[PDB]
Every structure is written in C-alpha cells, then in structure tokens.
C-alpha cells in the first residue's frame, strides 16, 4: 500500500496502488485506496483496512462541518478523538486529506503532518519511495501534479513488494 | 480449512473441505463449512469456529435486510461493526458470501474483497492453493462452476495438512 | 525530539527541535514542539504525539485556573489524573511548563520534576545531551537564556538521530 | 521465488520467476533462476537464499562433471556429503534439476526427492501455488509442458509477493 | 509420520505411512519409510527429519554389515558412538528396527530402548496413536501382526495431520 | 548510510553520505564511504557495519591487485571464497563498485549482483530512497550522472535518520 | 563509565570517572580508567567491560612497543588483526588514546576512528553527555583543555548512574 | 551464597555461609565455601556455580604453588590467561582471596580487583548485604575482624534466601 499526494501549480492530486495483502500473499489488486468525500469537495486516500477508513472518513465528514469546512481543523480535531476514544485506537491506519488550499496526513498514533515548502504527502509501506521519486521530480522536472504522482507510484510499486501497478488517481476538480 | 467460490456462465458455486482441527490433530471431518441463508437465497461458507460463523451469518441476515437485499452493502456494513464492536473483534474468521449477481469475501480484520474479472474467491489456510487451481481451470478449461470447485478443492486438500476430501458444495439455485 | 527550558537573569526560555519521526524515517521537520497557552501567559513544549499534547495542554488550562494560576499546583494536579484516568495513561509523552516564577517538567508515568539551583529542564530522546550542553554553559558563560537554549539544541540535534535543526524558541514576554 | 517443472510427452520444462527480494524490497526483477548444466543437457533451477542457492547449484555441478552427467547418481552422491559425519555448512536453499532421464529436487540439508507421478515439481515461496496450477492443468488439458509451466508461474506471481513476472523457461528438446 | 511394529506368533511387522510434510504442506504422499536391510533379513522404519532419519538409518546399516547382522549388538555399538567423548552431529530422528530375533527403537541422541512386553513399538508424530490402537487390539483380538499394524496406522492417519494413508508394511516371514 | 551510483554517457558516479551512527547517536558526520582503488581507476563505496564493511572492502582490494584490476572477474573470485566449503566470517555489509567497464554490488554473504539497466545501484539504509530518486530523475531529466547522484543522496538524507548531508562523490573521468 | 578527551593549544587531556558497576550495584568507586603508556608518553582510557577493556588496552600496548610508539600506525595495525580472516575474540569495549601527535578511539570490533575537528572524543555510557558538555564549552570559552575535561566528566556523572565523581585526569605536557 | 572478608589490626577474616542451592531447593546446608591454600597461609572463598567456582579455585591454586605463594602476582598471572588470545572456558564464579599481605577478589572472566580502603570484600548473592553490614560496623565499632564478618554473614542470611546460617570463618593469625 502506497499513497501519495502532490500539489503543484493549481492542482491537488492524490493517488495510489491497489494491492490488499495478507501476510505475504495477494488478496486483491483492483482496490481503490483513494476516495472522494464531502460532496466531491474533499478527496482522500487511505492505508489500512478499507473499512477502518470509511469508519474514519465518516467521522471526518461530520467532524469537518462543525468547524466550517476548514480542513486542517477537521483533522486536528479528528486525531483528538482517535486517541482518546477506546473504539478508535483499534483502527490503525494512515490517512491523507486534501482540498483547494492545503493538504494533510492524519495519524492514528502520532499527530497531523503538515507538508513542506514542496506540498507533498506520502504514507503506506511504500510511501517514502514514492515520496523519494515525487520530491525529486517536483524539484527539477516541470511535470504535472498528475504526471508526477503517476510516475512516482510506478517507482514505488516496483520496489515495495506490497505496492503494485493498478493505482487510482484523483485530480481536482 | 479451505473455502472457494466460483462464478462462471450463470452459475454461482461455493464449496469447501470439512476438517475441523486442534493444533496438529483431527477433531472432525464430516463438518459443513458452507451454509445457505436468507430463505435459501444467499449461500455462504466460513473459516473459523463454526459458531463464530453463525453469530456472524446471523448478524449478516439482519444487516442485509435493512439495506434491501443488496449483497455488497450488507457486507460493507458488516465489516463496519466487526471492527468497531468489542464483542466481534473476538470473532476471528474469514467469510465468503454470494448470490445471483456478484460474490464477496468478508474479513474480520481487513475489509471486503471484491473478485477479479474472473469472479473467484478463496479463504482458509488452503485457500490460495484452491484458488491457484481454480483460476487456472477457469482460464483454459470449459469446466462447470461445479466441475471446477470440485477439482479445485481436491487440489487444495492434497497439499494443506488441514484441508481434506469431505467437502460440501452448494450450487445455485 | 529534544525540548529544553532555561531560566537565567529574568528570562524564562523554552525551545526545541521539530523532527517528527516514524521508526527510522523522517515524517516532518518544520513542526512546533513548543506552544504558548493561557492567554499567552504560560508557554510550554512537548515530546509525543502533538495531539496527545493538546489533549493535555488543554486539560492543563482548566486544571490551572481552578487552583488560581499557581503553576506547580496545576501540574501536580495534572499528574494526579494522568495516572488515575484510564483515558490518559494512553497518552504517553513528556512535558515542560514555565512562567514568570518557576519552571516544571510533567510526566505521564512518574511525577513532576522540579529543577535544580540552576533552573534547567529537558526531555525527549535528545534531552540530556541538550541538558549536558546547557548546564555547562549556564555555569561558565554569561550567555542569554536565549543564547544558551539556542546553542544547546544545536548540540543535541547534532547527536540524537531524531533531533534536528529547525527548532522553535519562545522567550517571555 | 517460484520454480516449477513439468514433464510430459518427451518434454521437460523447468522455469521460474526472476525476482530477488531483499527484505520487503526488490533487488532486481530480472534474474535467471533456471540455467543449463553439463554442456547444456541438464536443467537446473535454484530457490532460497541467493548465496546458498548458488553455492548449492555449483556443488551439484561438480558432481555431474564427475559422473558422466548421470543425474540421479550425481544427486545421491552430493546428498551423501551431508550424511557422512561432518555436517557441512547446510545451505538453506533448494534445487529442481532434470534432463532427458528424470526430474529431481534436492534440498541443501541432505536429501534427494522424487515427483509423485504427475512429474510436477515446484520449490520456492510460490511453488505450491504454481504446483496447484500445474497439478491442475496437467490433469485437465493437453496443454504442452512448456505451456503449463508458463501459465503456472504466472498464476503464482499474481499471488506470491516475492514472485514477479519476468520468467525464464528453459526446456529440453 | 507414524511408524509402528507389532510382534506375535513368529511374525514381525513394521509398517508406516508415506507422507513427507514440509512445514504445513505436503511434499509427497508416497514415501517408503520402512525398508529392508542386511540382504533383506532385518526390518527398518525411520522417523523425524528426512535428512537426519536417512543419515541415522545408513549408520545403522554399516554396523549390521560389520556385526554378522546381529541386531541388538549392532545397535548398542552405534549407540556407543554418541556416548564416546566427541558428541556426534546428534541426528534428530528415530528408528524402529527388528528381525527374527527382537524389536528395538534407536534415537539419534544415543540410546537403544526395548518394548514393554506387548512387543509394540511406535515412533513418529502419530506413533502413540497407532500405539494405543495396537496396544489395544493386541490385548483384545487374535488379529494377525501384519493385521494390527495395518489397522493401527490407519487409525493414526485419521488423527495425525502429518500422517497419510499410503502405507508400506514390511513383514518378516 | 546511503550509497548510490549512476552511470550514463561515459560517466560513472558513486557517492554517499558520511554519517557513522552508533546506536541512536552520531559518532562522526564526516566519513568517506566512497573511495578509490587500483591506482585510482575503480570506484568503491561500502555499507553496513564499519568493521565488516572495511574488512569487505580490503578483501575486494586484494583481488583487484591480483587480477589486472579486471573488476567483474575480481568480484566473482571473492564471491567464490564464500561458496567454497569453509564458511568465512560472513561480513555483514555491502559494497558498490564500478569503473570504466561496469557497476556491481557485492554482499559479504557471497554474491555479486548486477544493475537492472538504468545502471542505478544503491545500498545502505537510505539506498532505496536515493534509488527511487535517481530511478526517477534518470527516466525524466538529462541531468548528468555526477548530478543525479548528488541530488538523490540529499533526498535520502532528508528521509533516513542514519544518513546525513556531508557527501563524498567520486566520479570516474 | 565516561571517558572524554579534549585537545587544544598544545594540550591533550584524557580523563574519566572511576566507577566499576556490577549489574545495578557498585563494585568500587575509585578506579583508574585512564593510564599512561610507552614510557609514559601516550595517553589511554578504556571503556566497556572491565575484562575486555583491559584485554583491549594490553593489545594496544604491545603494538606501540612494536612500532616506535607511532600511535596512528600502531592503531591501524591492531585494527588489522580483526580484519585479517580469523575473527578474534571481538572484545566488547572501547579505547580513547592520544599523545603529542593525535587523538583516536579504537573499538574492539576492528576499527580506528578520528575526531570531528573540535578534537573532542568520548566513549562510555556517559560519553555523549561529557561530549555535549565539552562540545559546548570548547565552542564558547577559552577554558583550558585540562579544564573542559574536568567539568565535562562531572556534568556526566550527575547524569549517568554508572558514572561517579572520583575522576582521574591524565594530561600530556 | 555470601562470602565476605574484613581486614583490620593485623587480622584478616574471610568467611561465608554453607548453602548449596539447586534451583529453588536446597542441596546441602553445610558446605565449606572458604578454605585454606598454600600449606595453609592464604585464605580463599568461592562464589557462583559449584562447578565453575571449584574450577576457578583450583586454577588459582596452581598459580600460587608456581609463584612462591606471592598472592597479588599469582592473581594477575591467572587473570592474564583470560586476556591472552584464546578465550578460556570463562568460568562463571568469583573468588575472594587474602593472606598476611592483601585481600583481592578475582572474577572468572579475567580480572583482579582491589578493596576500597575499608578492606571490605564480599561476593555472592548475599555479598552486598554482608557488605553493607560490615561497611557499617567497621565505620562504627571497634569490633574485631573475626567478629564483624561473623555478624555480617548472619545479617545477610536473614535476607538472602540462597544464604543460610551454617558459616565457616577462616581467619589468619
């Protein structure tokens, strides 16, 4: 599982592999680890039991309105219960949420991670690899936020033995 | 324990071994790991304490009506509580549910697994083996959804030292 | 993560690195592990899930008023629930709180730590190192409470492979 | 890694993937795991640890050169070296070797084993998978030997995360 | 594996299953675990690790050839080699050997042991099972020796997941 | 540590960080991990344990001096020493060596491995990171070889806590 | 134990605590951990296990006597003995040695390492502490070398529970 | 076991309990753990494992006979044997030896250590206890040496479950 979120020149893209795996065997490869939410306004990928995701991206929907759309808030508030609630600590995963202005990574254990002066996010076992490729690209090439994620995932999958080729990207809007 | 669900040319078949085992000894071999439900409309096999199964295939019956028969839903909703409820996380098993349109595998830990352009499902320790045989067969041979599962299980059992010969198949309708 | 609090000649300073890390990889380096609270009257850094921090520096705000600003109290009272509450023991971290008069380190496991005749505090994996540098400095040099912390963190980061350069200091007032 | 071999109608095929996996990452996708021996008249395919597999292979090679290439013999000889009295290094790997005469797998612990009857052999982490596949095919399809192998490996790779798609199929006219 | 031997009315039977189990999978169902020695006048059956069992067997074979086949002697001799002073490899396996004279099992750690009185011996993971069976039968049925063995193994196989049904019963006229 | 090498347009670059990490602390930030051999015509870079890396390097050095510097050969020779019969110390480290002819990494367990095609090699804890970076760059930018390397290492260091910024890039005119 | 050495203005100081800790108790507080070698012209300080530290020291002593006391050389020689081919005992300890020429620490695993530039070296459990202290001081105070050392050790002892106050500072006119 | 020795006013006393503890049970309460050497002019007391303690003692005995009984020397010699090059058995035990000249404890790992100044030495599981006692007494009571020892052991035995009351106090006129 490798998820990566790029942001360059007006475009906010998030996309990743689709390889569910049990130990050292493949269980599904067509999966979607990137989904849209909040009336197709906020797109976000995951890395864990896809269910754990929904039960989270659902607690995010609600916990987003209350604070009036302000993304970061909805998040900071989310990691505030993910650790205090004894029915969430059991939902280990990683999360990436992004919209028009910024982008953010949510954590079940630690706490929210705001991007660098490069605006790039990555999670999953194959993460950093993807990140390693992306960063580079958005530093020398003039590629598309969607021409980078693209290539970046390729670079991941071809290394992490848990990340593959069938990725699903989601530009905006 | 090996469960496999095939789908080819109008037929939806599910069948598997029948070897309950305690550590490295046999405790029962005539068991039924595939059962019919919802007024004989939905058939489904398991892989775990058969009880854990019923207490699950019972929570599926109800959680299926609410969403109006739509199989996938009843499932996605099921794995939604299997992880949030502290009285279900203690029910470790694997599950396969299928009906007229599609077929699906349920997970206690991860999350629902939708088949490939081949429509094949498999769980249990001997799973993949069965899967390995099936897939092949439904790719070259013109065998029956019931002539495949058949042979597939044979191929499993003869390898997994926990899967045997007394399988119980369930075509539809 | 390295946090250090110095107190010398009318100034109460607290500042530390900004390297969030997952195992042996870097996840963020621009982070702020030192924050101001109670109407900018009390500044305090942390060392753990930044969230765990807020959910703590929030339980400190309230638990501070009740006892009428008296810092030490608000603290001693804080570590009194951090261990009796089954929803706090799950918030492992380290904390440093300081204001006009004194400075104090809070613990999730042990209990409050009052400084020495030197008025210096330190936590985080890189702590002692920072401490090791500070102490020395505030014993021979006539450096600023802010010219010490400064150099002290540098000395830490360059040793702890979890502490870096992007520190955020907070003098008073 | 996956290495399977099928023998039917004067044809002997031994082929395998090409993935070298270091921990959970990929060293190189292209790797020749099946090769030719004795002037190119006996087929070989090694599994396990790169180091110990190669050192196993080489040792089998010396024997051949020393026994007019008579396979079976050569094997039992090598096996003997582990059964003597001074426990040799005990290489952790496995080899599948065959020629115009017979097929045979050899562990590096000290034994030579023969195929059931379906003349199907398969070692590696993906073996059993490719096995099942072939064990099936063979029983239900007049597919060539150089054909079953080709499809069985693939079936595996799509299952074993340590088994890729860059195969190498050495047959023996 | 299961290897049991019964001796009654001038008859000595030593037979066992034929399953080679690699981890929790099956290498080969047909395997001769009982064989003939000394021109074919002394029966043998090995248990444990394929490698170490075979290397145990062979060592017992040299002794016989060196002691006019006199079983008992041959055994104590071999045993001696482990009791000398330089701890030999210490093979992890077990052998059940017998002929017209007596029955005897030999561990690869250094000892020779004799049957209670019912002249019943059984090693392997299924042993005790087959034992119980025979230990019973014998005490309550004039069933032949070449008969008790046949049924006892089977009783085992239907219990031990590492013991199959493809037996091999070598008796001694 | 991170050691990566890229080869393009008659240029061969092998460079790496300079951090020596003792446990979770830093021994020395400046360290030459890439050096010159054979009168200075073949490049080397070692990874792993200071002790075993150096002792690996030295052994590769003797071989060269003994084989007219012919790299490839020299390697296979050294490798052979581990495959002989008496298992050598088995150094836990890795070397990336190259010259005007080819690139090649050598483990201290006994093998020599070659690059995919992108002529990109990278060992160390940060390797894969620098790899991804370069594996990218190369595929999308006419950046020099002595350039890709420089940027890839850096990308790594900003990720691997055991990889610093004091590089050393030895190229080969 | 803590052993640190600083070198500035023709002065070389190597001093350390004196505590011998058996498990969590104290063997003896007074212990000379820094001593003189080669007629008393080269300074030494050992860390780690009493046994292996002493046996490391002695071995470094033979080398000196054998190489006109030329430090650096002597070191690399000793180091070589671990890199030869027959892995020596591999003493678990560390030595900090220096004289009028240079400073140098030597592990008992097989390597010689040099100081950054601040000519500061420190081994032992308290090392890094004393390090930080000195690494600081030096950068901000014209304190002597025989002075920094004295204060740095102390700073450590007040931190490391295995480092006491009975120092021994051997300088080199 | 507890073995303590005190030296004051021309008197040297070395005495200890007599309990041999096998696991958590008692082998024999009466055991002479302190004995006489060199025609009966040097005192000895061993601790640790019966086997390795005795084999340590004996080795110290050979040395004496070989060095005109000159204690100190004899010790350093023995110690040397562990520091040579071929790591000896490494006995897990400890000895407290003394005579008219000095006191000295010797570990079986390779070192000789001297008393603080209070001339108090104590090894064994109860040592530190008896130590504390004597370390006290001595500092506050003109109690004889053959007296402090007697009381210190007892204080221990009433604390260490592996230290009984059947003492043996060998003094040296």
């Amino acid at each position: 599982t490798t998820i990566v979120s790029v942001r360059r020149n007006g475009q906010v893209v998030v996309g990743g592999d689709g390889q569910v795996s049990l130990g050292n065997t493949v269980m599904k490869g067509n999966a979607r680890k990137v989904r849209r939410l909040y009336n197709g306004k906020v797109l976000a990928g995951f890395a864990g039991g896809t269910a754990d995701a929904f039960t989270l991206f659902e607690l995010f929907e609600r916990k987003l309105e209350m604070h009036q759309g302000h993304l970061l808030k909805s998040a900071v508030e989310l990691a505030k219960d993910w650790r205090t609630d004894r029915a969430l600590r059991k939902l280990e995963a990683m999360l990436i949420v992004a919209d028009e202005k910024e982008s953010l990574i949510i954590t079940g254990i630690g706490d929210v991670v705001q991007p660098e002066e490069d605006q790039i996010l990555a999670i999953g076992s194959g993460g950093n690899y993807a990140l390693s490729a992306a960063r580079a690209l958005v530093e020398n090439t003039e590629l598309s936020a969607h021409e980078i994620v693209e290539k970046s995932l390729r670079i991941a999958g071809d290394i992490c033995v848990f990340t593959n080729t069938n990725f699903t990207i989601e530009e905006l809007p | 324990t090996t469960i496999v669900s095939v789908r080819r040319n109008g037929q939806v078949v599910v069948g598997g071994d029948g070897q309950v085992s305690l550590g490295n000894t046999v405790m029962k071999g005539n068991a039924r790991k595939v059962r019919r439900l919802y007024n004989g409309k939905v058939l489904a096999g398991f892989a775990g304490g058969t009880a854990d199964a019923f207490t699950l295939f019972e929570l599926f019956e109800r959680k299926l009506e609410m969403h109006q028969g739509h199989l996938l839903k009843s499932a996605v909703e099921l794995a939604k509580d299997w992880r949030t409820d502290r009285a279900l996380r203690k029910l470790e098993a694997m599950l396969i549910v299928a009906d007229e349109k599609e077929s699906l595998i349920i997970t206690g830990i991860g999350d629902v697994v939708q088949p490939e352009e081949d429509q094949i499902l498999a769980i249990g320790s001997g799973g993949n083996y069965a899967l390995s045989a099936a897939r092949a067969l439904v790719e070259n041979t013109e065998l029956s959804a019931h002539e495949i599962v058949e042979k597939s299980l044979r191929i499993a059992g003869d390898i997994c030292v926990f899967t045997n010969t007394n399988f119980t198949i369930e075509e539809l309708p | 993560t390295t946090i250090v609090s110095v107190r010398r000649n009318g100034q109460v300073v607290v500042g530390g690195d900004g390297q969030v890390s997952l195992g042996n990889t870097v996840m963020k380096g621009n982070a702020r592990k030192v924050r101001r609270l109670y109407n900018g009257k009390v500044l305090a850094g942390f060392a753990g899930g930044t969230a765990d921090a807020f959910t703590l520096f929030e339980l400190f705000e309230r638990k501070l008023e009740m006892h009428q600003g008296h810092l030490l109290k608000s603290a001693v009272e804080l570590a009194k629930d951090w261990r009796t509450d089954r929803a706090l023991r799950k918030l492992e971290a380290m904390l440093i709180v300081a204001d006009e008069k004194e400075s104090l380190i809070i613990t999730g496991i042990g209990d409050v730590v009052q400084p020495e005749e030197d008025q210096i505090l330190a936590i985080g994996s890189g702590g002692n190192y920072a401490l090791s540098a500070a102490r020395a400095l505030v014993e021979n040099t006539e450096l600023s409470a802010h010219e010490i912390v400064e150099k002290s963190l540098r000395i830490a980061g360059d040793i702890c492979v979890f502490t870096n350069t992007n520190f955020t200091i907070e003098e008073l007032p | 890694t996956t290495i399977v071999s099928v023998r039917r109608n004067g044809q002997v095929v031994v082929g395998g993937d090409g993935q070298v996996s270091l921990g959970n990452t990929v060293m190189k996708g292209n790797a020749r795991k099946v090769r030719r021996l004795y002037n190119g008249k006996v087929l070989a395919g090694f599994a396990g640890g790169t180091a110990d597999a190669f050192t196993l292979f080489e040792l089998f090679e010396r024997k051949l050169e020393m026994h007019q290439g008579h396979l079976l013999k050569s094997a039992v000889e090598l096996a003997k070296d582990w059964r003597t009295d001074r426990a040799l290094r005990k290489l952790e790997a496995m080899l599948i070797v065959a020629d115009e005469k017979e097929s045979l797998i050899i562990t590096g612990i000290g034994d030579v084993v023969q195929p059931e009857e379906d003349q199907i052999l398969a070692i590696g982490s993906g073996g059993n998978y490719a096995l099942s596949a072939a064990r099936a095919l063979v029983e239900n399809t007049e597919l060539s030997a150089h054909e079953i192998v080709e499809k069985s490996l693939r079936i595996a790779g799509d299952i074993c995360v340590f088994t890729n798609t860059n195969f190498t199929i050495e047959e023996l006219p | 594996t299961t290897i049991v031997s019964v001796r009654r009315n001038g008859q000595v039977v030593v037979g066992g299953d034929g399953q080679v189990s690699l981890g929790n999978t099956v290498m080969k169902g047909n395997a001769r675990k009982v064989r003939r020695l000394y021109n074919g006048k002394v029966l043998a059956g090995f248990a444990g690790g394929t490698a170490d069992a075979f290397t145990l067997f062979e060592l017992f074979e040299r002794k016989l050839e060196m002691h006019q086949g006199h079983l008992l002697k041959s055994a104590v001799e071999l045993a001696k080699d482990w009791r000398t002073d330089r701890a030999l490899r210490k093979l992890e396996a077990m052998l059940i050997v017998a002929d017209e004279k007596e029955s005897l099992i030999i561990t690869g750690i250094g000892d020779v042991v004799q049957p209670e009185e019912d002249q019943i011996l059984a090693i392997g993971s299924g042993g005790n099972y087959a034992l119980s069976a025979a230990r019973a039968l014998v005490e309550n049925t004039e069933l032949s020796a070449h008969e008790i063995v046949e049924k006892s193994l089977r009783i085992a196989g239907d219990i031990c997941v590492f013991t199959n049904t493809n037996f091999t019963i070598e008796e001694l006229p | 540590t991170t050691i990566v090498s890229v080869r393009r347009n008659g240029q061969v670059v092998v460079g790496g960080d300079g951090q020596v990490s003792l446990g979770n602390t830093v021994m020395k930030g400046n360290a030459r991990k890439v050096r010159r051999l054979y009168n200075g015509k073949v490049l080397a870079g070692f990874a792993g344990g200071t002790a075993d890396a150096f002792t690996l390097f030295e052994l590769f050095e003797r071989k060269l001096e003994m084989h007219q510097g012919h790299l490839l050969k020299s390697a296979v020779e050294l490798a052979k020493d581990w495959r002989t019969d008496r298992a050598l110390r088995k150094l836990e480290a890795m070397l990336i060596v190259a010259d005007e002819k080819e690139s090649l990494i050598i483990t201290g367990i006994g093998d020599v491995v070659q690059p995919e095609e992108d002529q990109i090699l990278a060992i160390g804890s940060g390797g894969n990171y620098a790899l991804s970076a370069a594996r990218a760059l190369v595929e999308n930018t006419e950046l020099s070889a002595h350039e890709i390397v420089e940027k890839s290492l850096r990308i790594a260091g900003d990720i691997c806590v055991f990889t610093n910024t004091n590089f050393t890039i030895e190229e080969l005119p | 134990t803590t052993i640190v050495s600083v070198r500035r203005n023709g002065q070389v100081v190597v001093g350390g605590d004196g505590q011998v800790s058996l498990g969590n108790t104290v063997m003896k507080g007074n212990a000379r951990k820094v001593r003189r070698l080669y007629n008393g012209k080269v300074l030494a300080g050992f860390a780690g296990g009493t046994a292996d530290a002493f046996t490391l020291f002695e071995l470094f002593e033979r080398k000196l006597e054998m190489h006109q006391g030329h430090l650096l050389k002597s070191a690399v020689e000793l180091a070589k003995d671990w890199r030869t081919d027959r892995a020596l005992r591999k003493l678990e300890a560390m030595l900090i040695v220096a004289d009028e020429k240079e400073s140098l620490i030597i592990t008992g695993i097989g390597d010689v390492v040099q100081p950054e530039e601040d000519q500061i070296l420190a081994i032992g459990s308290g090392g890094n502490y004393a390090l930080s202290a000195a690494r600081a001081l030096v950068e901000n105070t014209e304190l002597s070398a025989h002075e920094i050392v004295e204060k740095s050790l102390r700073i450590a002892g007040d931190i490391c529970v295995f480092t006491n106050t009975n120092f021994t500072i051997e300088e080199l006119p | 076991t507890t073995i303590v020795s005190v030296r004051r006013n021309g008197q040297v006393v070395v005495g200890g309990d007599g309990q041999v503890s096998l696991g958590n049970t008692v082998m024999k309460g009466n055991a002479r753990k302190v004995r006489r050497l060199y025609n009966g002019k040097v005192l000895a007391g061993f601790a640790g494992g019966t086997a390795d303690a005795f084999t340590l003692f004996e080795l110290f005995e050979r040395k004496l006979e070989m060095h005109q009984g000159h204690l100190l020397k004899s010790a350093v010699e023995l110690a040397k044997d562990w520091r040579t090059d071929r790591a000896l058995r490494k006995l897990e035990a400890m000895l407290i030896v003394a005579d008219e000249k000095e006191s000295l404890i010797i570990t079986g790992i390779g070192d000789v250590v001297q008393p603080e100044e209070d001339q108090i030495l104590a090894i064994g599981s109860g040592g530190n206890y008896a130590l504390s006692a004597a370390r006290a007494l001595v500092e506050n009571t003109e109690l004889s040496a053959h007296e402090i020892v007697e009381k210190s052991l007892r204080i221990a035995g009433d604390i260490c479950v592996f230290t009984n009351t059947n003492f043996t106090i060998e003094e040296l006129p």
Binding site: - | - | - | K28, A31, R35 | - | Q68, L72, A75, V76, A79, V112, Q114 | - | -
Partner: protein, 103 residues
C-alpha cells in the same frame, strides 16, 4: 615487437633457424611481427597475464602448421605476413561466460 626480433636468438630468429633445417626459408614481416605482438599483449590483458612467456604461445599457436608439414617443403620459402598471422590465431576462444556465477 622488440623482444620478438631484437634480442639474440629472438623467437623469430629461432623458428626461422629451425625451419631452415628442413630446408625451408621463412621470413617474418614487420606487419606480421606487429600483429603477433598485439596478439600476445591482448590475451595477457584479457585473460591471465603471464608476462612475455606469452610470446612463446602466440608464437607456437601460429607456427603449428608450418612446423609440422615443413619437412615436405624442402626448397620452398614461406612468407609470414598479416593475413597469415591473423588466420592462425582464431580471435577469441571459449564462451568465457563468467556470468553463471552472477545474479
């Protein structure tokens, strides 16, 4: 090239004097010598460098043919030029695949 002709009793000087026994007259051509030499240096580099003894190889691997049939050539003279040399020394022998050990 130099060792090949210059010294006293150089390789060429020798084979020449020998064939002269069967009643044959051989003549080495500069261009040939040059090649013989390039040859030696080659293999020494490409395989196992044995110094100058290597000339004793390339030399004998070349003079094989004449050395044998030279008895039945009395009267003739032989000219060893490039085209000759180039044809007595194959090009490169054995697949020499050192890859079977690499991954």
């Amino acid at each position: 090239e130099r060792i090949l002709t210059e010294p006293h009793a150089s390789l060429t000087e020798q084979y020449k004097a020998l064939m002269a026994t069967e009643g044959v007259n051989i003549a080495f051509t500069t261009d040939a010598v040059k090649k013989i030499a390039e040859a030696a240096f080659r293999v020494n580099e490409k395989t196992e460098n044995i110094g100058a003894r290597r000339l004793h190889t390339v030399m004998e691997r070349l003079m094989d043919k004449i050395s044998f049939s030279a008895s039945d050539m009395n009267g003739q003279t032989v000219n060893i030029d490039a085209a000759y040399v180039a044809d007595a020394l194959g090009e490169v022998v054995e697949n020499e695949d050192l890859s079977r050990f690499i991954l």
